[PDB]
Design an enzyme around this catalytic site. Structure first.
Site, PDB file in Angstrom:
ATOM      1  N   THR A 126       0.850  -1.183   0.000  1.00  0.00           N
ATOM      2  CA  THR A 126       0.000   0.000   0.000  1.00  0.00           C
ATOM      3  C   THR A 126       0.878   1.222   0.000  1.00  0.00           C
ATOM      4  O   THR A 126       2.040   1.061   0.447  1.00  0.00           O
ATOM      5  CB  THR A 126      -0.909  -0.030   1.227  1.00  0.00           C
ATOM      6  OG1 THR A 126      -1.391  -1.379   1.367  1.00  0.00           O
ATOM      7  CG2 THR A 126      -2.028   0.973   0.973  1.00  0.00           C
ATOM      8  N   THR A 145      -2.727   3.207   6.074  1.00  0.00           N
ATOM      9  CA  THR A 145      -2.210   1.941   5.553  1.00  0.00           C
ATOM     10  C   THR A 145      -2.350   0.759   6.534  1.00  0.00           C
ATOM     11  O   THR A 145      -2.588   0.965   7.710  1.00  0.00           O
ATOM     12  CB  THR A 145      -0.750   2.111   5.030  1.00  0.00           C
ATOM     13  OG1 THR A 145      -0.294   0.888   4.454  1.00  0.00           O
ATOM     14  CG2 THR A 145       0.211   2.552   6.121  1.00  0.00           C
ATOM     15  N   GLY A 146      -2.203  -0.469   6.029  1.00  0.00           N
ATOM     16  CA  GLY A 146      -2.280  -1.693   6.838  1.00  0.00           C
ATOM     17  C   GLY A 146      -3.450  -2.578   6.452  1.00  0.00           C
ATOM     18  O   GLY A 146      -3.665  -2.853   5.268  1.00  0.00           O
ATOM     19  N   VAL A 168     -11.975  -5.400  -2.118  1.00  0.00           N
ATOM     20  CA  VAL A 168     -11.732  -3.974  -2.189  1.00  0.00           C
ATOM     21  C   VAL A 168     -11.478  -3.535  -0.770  1.00  0.00           C
ATOM     22  O   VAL A 168     -12.326  -3.724   0.102  1.00  0.00           O
ATOM     23  CB  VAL A 168     -12.932  -3.177  -2.775  1.00  0.00           C
ATOM     24  CG1 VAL A 168     -12.686  -1.685  -2.629  1.00  0.00           C
ATOM     25  CG2 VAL A 168     -13.127  -3.499  -4.233  1.00  0.00           C
ATOM     26  N   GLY A 169     -10.295  -2.969  -0.542  1.00  0.00           N
ATOM     27  CA  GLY A 169      -9.893  -2.526   0.759  1.00  0.00           C
ATOM     28  C   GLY A 169     -10.325  -1.103   0.991  1.00  0.00           C
ATOM     29  O   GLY A 169     -11.214  -0.590   0.305  1.00  0.00           O
ATOM     30  N   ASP A 170      -9.681  -0.474   1.964  1.00  0.00           N
ATOM     31  CA  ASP A 170      -9.856   0.955   2.242  1.00  0.00           C
ATOM     32  C   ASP A 170      -9.396   1.906   1.138  1.00  0.00           C
ATOM     33  O   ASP A 170     -10.086   2.896   0.854  1.00  0.00           O
ATOM     34  CB  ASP A 170      -9.141   1.317   3.529  1.00  0.00           C
ATOM     35  CG  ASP A 170      -7.683   0.926   3.489  1.00  0.00           C
ATOM     36  OD1 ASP A 170      -7.437  -0.242   3.132  1.00  0.00           O
ATOM     37  OD2 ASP A 170      -6.788   1.786   3.730  1.00  0.00           O
TER      38      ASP A 170
HETATM   39  C1  LIG Z   1      -2.029  -1.903   2.595  1.00  0.00           C
HETATM   40  O1  LIG Z   1      -1.547  -2.832   3.248  1.00  0.00           O
HETATM   41  C2  LIG Z   1      -3.312  -1.383   3.149  1.00  0.00           C
HETATM   42  C3  LIG Z   1      -4.586  -1.540   2.326  1.00  0.00           C
HETATM   43  N1  LIG Z   1      -5.377  -0.785   3.276  1.00  0.00           N
HETATM   44  C4  LIG Z   1      -5.205  -2.922   2.019  1.00  0.00           C
HETATM   45  O2  LIG Z   1      -5.867  -3.057   0.956  1.00  0.00           O
HETATM   46  O3  LIG Z   1      -5.103  -3.921   2.780  1.00  0.00           O
END
Ligand SMILES: *C(=O)C[C@H](N)C(=O)O
Ligand SMILES: *C(=O)C[C@H](N)C(=O)O
Ligand code: NA
Ligand code: NA
Lengths: 295, 295
Positions: B155, B206-207, B184-186
């Site tokens: 990220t 991030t994370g 789909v993440g943040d």
């Molecule tokens: C990157 O590790 C962070 C991101 N928020 C994700 O998609 O996990």
């Protein structure tokens, strides 16, 4: 053990055809009573929002599931989200097509994946891995909806507090008329279309999607209630920010952890229905509110 | 007028080995340099944040663009989002394939459409329209993430304050290794993956994307500033809160409307660098910082 409550809203937009209002009225009542019928048997805040929203998807008078408005290419793509107030657990789908019930898929995202958010083809796959019936596209597309698209070519939600005083939201939408393919709104995006937290309350939103995301309307409404404002004050404060900052209109419903609830909108209309103490509250236009008995 | 500042990160991850330590340093150094030069040349915060994230999208050493994590199928799927705090204009894209710079496509959604978020099939249609080339997904695949995905089965971001007083963020990612198709993440969700407001500050996070989305982390960090917490106390509580409530770990970078800035994280490591007042600040580990001069 607290007095349960479900609130229900049905897209917040411009003025509606006076005949169609009866059909919209009976749709709000139905979702509320189903939602309330689910609380009645000591059922969860999560169980309840989902059942209310399932009904409105299936109701062609509302722009989620059957009744979804069209995208620029004449088709139906839909967005949804659900959240558990207790541990803030959540599920969402964006840009799904050819299934009946978006809010249940989000719940399938929530409790049956380690993830919170699936989109487009991955979610079309996930639904098929979960045994979800594909339905013909002609069924989701109504006639009024083909008409709205032509004239341009020239959202629903539920909040609930259960007997244990947990809270939840659900929001579901076909999007916005003549939207681009792949366009994602605020509906499936936690903190914008809805947010639920036992330490505050839960909210579901409707309005100019982009503007709802831009300002994170649902979390903001909550920011206030934590600060001490009333439900009605907080709803006032956030919707005005969305108007004063990003020139966008919309509507909201909230019930806080104390069981106080209101439905407020800066749009022309927002049909709403709350149920609490066996009495159903209904309205479409500002400052005209009916109350009847729940059987 | 404001002295400008850029802060950059990849990604709130685990232990970093010695061989990776150095390349990672070089990548961060380059990206912070690209952004600061834009700000020293009269560019906007948006130009500068887009600037630095393309540098980490292009660099194979970082989880975004080329060198992104591979999904369940062994395919790169990417999310990126960008936001200007001036008017809250924003752009975001989810599950984008076969393209070098998702953040570049995110900017154009903001700039060229009436929308703020697009996904997958629709993402690509708009890509092709704007002339964004198509590259074989293979060319984003690194033997590192190749190895990592076989084993897993058995990220990047920046904030800027500019000489006009404008703040911005940009965030891009390949996600978590072996994610479900279309997870789909943040990183494309405003409030979660980041937030920019000219009247408070800008944040890029991030994370673990599932946790970030539930606590609404970036916008959480900014409510804390709004209550007059310094940028450090604001990072620490909002990270402190994710940890306990959803047991999430990550990191962020944050800049106040006045030029104060910070990098904190709760994971083990987070690459970050910052250029202000003619110097560079860099790190990976808690207080491993080397402050040098910048030509
Ligand atoms: C990157 O590790 C962070 C991101 N928020 C994700 O998609 O996990
Ligand atoms: C529903 O009111 C519209 C929704 N907010 C959207 O998809 O933009
Ligand atoms: Na419907
Ligand atoms: Na990269």
């Amino acid at each position: 053990h607290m007095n349960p409550i479900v609130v229900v809203h049905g897209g917040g937009a411009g003025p509606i055809s006076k005949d169609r209002k009866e059909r919209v009225h009976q749709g709000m009542v139905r979702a509320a009573t189903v939602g309330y019928g689910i609380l009645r048997e000591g059922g969860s805040a999560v169980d309840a929002v989902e059942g209310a929203v399932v009904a409105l998807e299936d109701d062609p008078e509302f722009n989620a599931g059957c009744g979804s408005v069209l995208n620029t290419n004449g088709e139906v793509e839909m967005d949804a989200s659900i959240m558990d107030g207790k541990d803030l657990s959540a599920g969402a789908v964006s840009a799904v097509q050819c299934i009946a019930n978006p809010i249940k898929l989000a719940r399938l995202v929530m409790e049956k994946t380690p993830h919170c958010f699936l989109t487009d083809q991955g979610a079309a796959q996930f639904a098929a891995a979960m045994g979800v019936p594909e339905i013909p596209g002609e069924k989701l597309v109504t006639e009024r909806n083909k008409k709205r698209l032509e004239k341009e070519k020239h959202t629903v939600g539920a909040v609930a507090l259960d007997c244990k005083g947990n809270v939840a939201y659900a929001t579901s939408t076909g999007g916005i008329v003549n939207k681009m393919v792949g366009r994602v709104g605020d509906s499936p995006c936690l903190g914008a279309g809805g947010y639920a937290d036992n330490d505050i309350g839960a909210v579901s939103t409707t309005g100019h999607g982009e503007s709802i995301l831009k300002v994170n309307l649902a979390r903001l409404t909550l920011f206030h209630i934590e600060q001490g404002k009333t439900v009605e004050e907080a709803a006032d404060l956030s919707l005005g920010y969305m108007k004063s900052r990003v020139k966008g209109l919309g509507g909201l419903i909230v019930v806080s952890k104390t069981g106080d609830w209101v439905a407020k909108w800066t749009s022309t209309s927002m049909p709403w229905a709350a149920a609490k103490d066996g009495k159903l509250h209904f309205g479409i236009d500002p400052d005209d509110t009916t109350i009847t008995d729940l059987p």
